[PDB]
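Blackboard transcription, Thursday session:
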Amino acid sequence: KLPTNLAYERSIDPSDVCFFVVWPDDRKTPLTYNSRTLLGQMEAASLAYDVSGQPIKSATAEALAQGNPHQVDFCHVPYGASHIECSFSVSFSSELRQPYKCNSSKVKQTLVQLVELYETKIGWTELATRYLMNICNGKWLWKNTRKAYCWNIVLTPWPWNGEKVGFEDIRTNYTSRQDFKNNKNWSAIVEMIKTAFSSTDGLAIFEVRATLHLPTNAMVRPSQVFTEQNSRVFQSTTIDGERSPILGAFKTGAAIATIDDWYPEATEPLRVGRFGVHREDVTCYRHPSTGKDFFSILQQAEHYIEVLSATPAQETINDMHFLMANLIKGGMFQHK
Amino acid sequence: MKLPTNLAYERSIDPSDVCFFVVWPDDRKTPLTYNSRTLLGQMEAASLAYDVSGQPATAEALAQGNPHQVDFCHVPYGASHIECSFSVSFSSELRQPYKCNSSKVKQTLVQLVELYETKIGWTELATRYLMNICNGKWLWKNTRKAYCWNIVLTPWPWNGEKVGFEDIRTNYTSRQDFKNNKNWSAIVEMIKTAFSSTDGLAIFEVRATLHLPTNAMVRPSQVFTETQNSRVFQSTTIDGERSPILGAFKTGAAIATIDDWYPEATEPLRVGRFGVHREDVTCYRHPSTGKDFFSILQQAEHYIEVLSANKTPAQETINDMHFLMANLIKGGMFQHK
Amino acid sequence: LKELIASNPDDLTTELKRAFRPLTPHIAIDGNELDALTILVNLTDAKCKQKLRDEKWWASCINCVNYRQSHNPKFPDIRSEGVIRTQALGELPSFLLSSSKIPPYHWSYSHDSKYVNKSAFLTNEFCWDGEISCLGELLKDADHPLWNTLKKLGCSQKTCKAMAKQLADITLTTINVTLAPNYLTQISLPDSDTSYISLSPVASLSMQSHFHQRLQDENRHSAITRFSRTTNMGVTAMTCGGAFRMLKSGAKFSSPPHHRLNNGSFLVLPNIRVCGATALSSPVTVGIPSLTAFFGFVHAFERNINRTTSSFRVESFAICVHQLHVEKRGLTAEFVEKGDGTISAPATRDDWQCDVVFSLILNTNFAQHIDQDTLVTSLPKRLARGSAKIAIDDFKHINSFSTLETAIESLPIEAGRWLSLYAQSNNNLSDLLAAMTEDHQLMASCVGYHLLEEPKDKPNSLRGYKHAIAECIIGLINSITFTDPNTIFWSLKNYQNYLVVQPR
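(Written on the board underneath:)
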């Protein structure tokens, strides 16, 4: 139980996204951006009201009508383009089977036996379906597919004997979970994610592109930097000697690892983690005063081993989905 | 038997850095760069929420993220593949002591190496050292999650071609796969002539092509130092850029990862005095088990006379022979204290 | 230098802790010693020790001059088992440096981790009116002033003062390092023509304080090197625990011209690449390696290749540094035994190292080449712990020309910086930092060894040779765009008190 040196490494490795404009010639140019300074009103609540109460005497009626300047990095689709194309790649590996560092060899065989029992009594179908439904519907295009006409996704898997896989008109056709399962090769690309997790040194690699038909001069929203002045600075790259915005490397990984809806109130999915952090609501679920954090489940592994060796789906199956989806991304579990 | 007050051997293999180049589809080579990057992680530690067994940490204090700063390296968009260049030189310094305070252990250990290489050839140690250069174990985790990789090498001294292994995940799985190409035999035998002869030499220059996915990540070696900069890379200055190198004592640990004769012997280990592992850390061949190096070196007086008779047991004596020889190739300072 | 008119900075009590341990000039007292020695007795075991000064007074604080020393064998490897309290023997030319140019008084205590609190009362400095030294030398007579706390503080009785007088009579001559067994760095060099000498370089905390203190203004030349960990190396490491700042160039590499134009026996060697070399060469400088490393490389090369032609006699060498990159990497040791039964890693040290690309042109006495089968297998693979090799598609440019000016257009590398030295008066550090910012591509390498002992002999040497003890020389290294071949072509000379690679 927490043997003072324990670590895993990730089993799903995504990459940067890249943006290209296509013209009606069908030639492809890298999307660019540029800074601009702009003029806003004094719309705070702190230059006018004090802390806790009565408004200031220094904020008069012609100090609130002054206007302050700011800089933003601005990016849009050029006039005369046809659509945007976005490309990246994912790589499902088999690194969850054994811990990467384990000081005491007593919990190591416990974790190996737990992963094998979970593999053999429950499928790999639920986790692989929940991961693959986020790649081929544009969850990784965070708030770009909102306010758009349509967007279409094309897959190139490895290893593969055949054709590229095509999802088209995703807002209209692919609304539910059944709408994937009646694609003609849904159940042929889940199986390779399954045998990627199942084998000792298995591997699967997907290469993904997607086209976005945004309207005229529409706005494109890439990821941003952690700056400790300029507000809204973008994360950039260099494609064909240019400067282009990316939309993330870790942000893409956070986009396909939001499958957690096994928590107590259980309304809408969230990012798999230790203590169940929600980002809109700035509280957390899964708190260590509810017995549902990852460490209170990791300290019950022998109870799970003996219950998987004879299972009803009330919370035990959900707690071990949570444990396995937290070993697919996992890191240090040391406590110094 | 007693080891002298000072005793040390110079090493017999010495490699270099593995410098990375990227190639473009008009066939031009440029060095590979990296950048720092700050990033917003979560409160994920266990000391943040626990103290010994109980909790100190409110539910909105676990939900406030924290910044880190990493280095980050990847394959640039629109490239063909990655080239990796490397050098290694097998020599003959495993037979002369570099420093000794006596004369008996001197003559004893030089006649041990001559009786060894007469009765048991250098074919096992050379075919173990060489197939860590011909499958790319000098690329930790870069070989994983790639489509295919290829190795070519130029030996020296040589007349003829460049020796070439292609598509190593597919068809060069095993020992016989290396053993039945065109010229495995000459490159094994020149390592054998390097070890056997006095003041000989055998050099190899190796370079690999690695065929990664789109914007794949590159994983070089990291620095050793005890504000928020985790994951620093070891770099060099190559023709106007600052590039990642993948080690200089690390690649030597790739080549010398041959130890397979220890009391349970699951996977090969890096050779050393005590049989140290670091992932799933413990030291089998512990020095109380009598199977470290400072016990085999004491039993070397017996091992002199057992290689005067005819039939070695081939299990418990030649494994000690291969282990003592591998540590003599590795290096010295055997000063017992 | 900080007298009683400004003895109170009124921040906190760090002034006494700073002024006790030597990295800085000292404070002067005349009769106000009761402010110090009522804390000093209560440092071990403020107006409390006045009935218990006489305990922990037998021999414990008195014995810590025997362990006090002038030169530190525990740098940077702490298991050394020595004491060295002997300055030097000889004098130098003025452009070189040693621990002889600066006053010997900053000596301290490096023996133990539990007896750190016992180095008081006999290791510090008072600086009454000049000739600043420690307390053990100026307290060997009968008539001595400032004895008010002997006639007044009646807890100190008169029964152990004469033992402190008679115990510290002669201690400036005792040297005892024992090489059987420890972790002592030991080296060999030809001092005479045939009779080699196995000398041993050590570190001076006095030179360490001199090179330490001035650079706090100049953080452009700051190289923080935290060491073993401050428990057992010595209190001189506890004084500046963490920083340990040292000298570096303060600028990266640049773009020169190798040549603007276009004896004999010039043997040409291009494109030597050295990975994993040694950048921390001196105790005080961080940058390019020693020149004795290049000398040892050349001497090992000729002592290889004189199997058949024992007339080879390289006798001189010119060095051309084509590329230099220096950075921090560290070094992982291999879990050696701590002594009883436990296997774990040794202490953690922090390390600077460098990738050096350079070409040599030797000036031998043999008339022609040797071989190309047996030129490459005659060259060593080692240069100041590094791995130093030549690419095997570049063996064609090894040859022996017969004049210098035809050797420069046969190097297919083309960026210069040939190495000479700066032979002007630089007898401190301040006339080095006032000598660097004009071109600031300038280096301060290791130039030689100023000896200490005679030499003499004692058993466990390298190869029966004679073991002297020495220290380093911190001369300056400059560069040449390049024409007279005697401002280049270094050579080793012996002057019976030091060893310096000189350009003939």
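Lecturer's comment: The radius of gyration of chain A is 24 Å.
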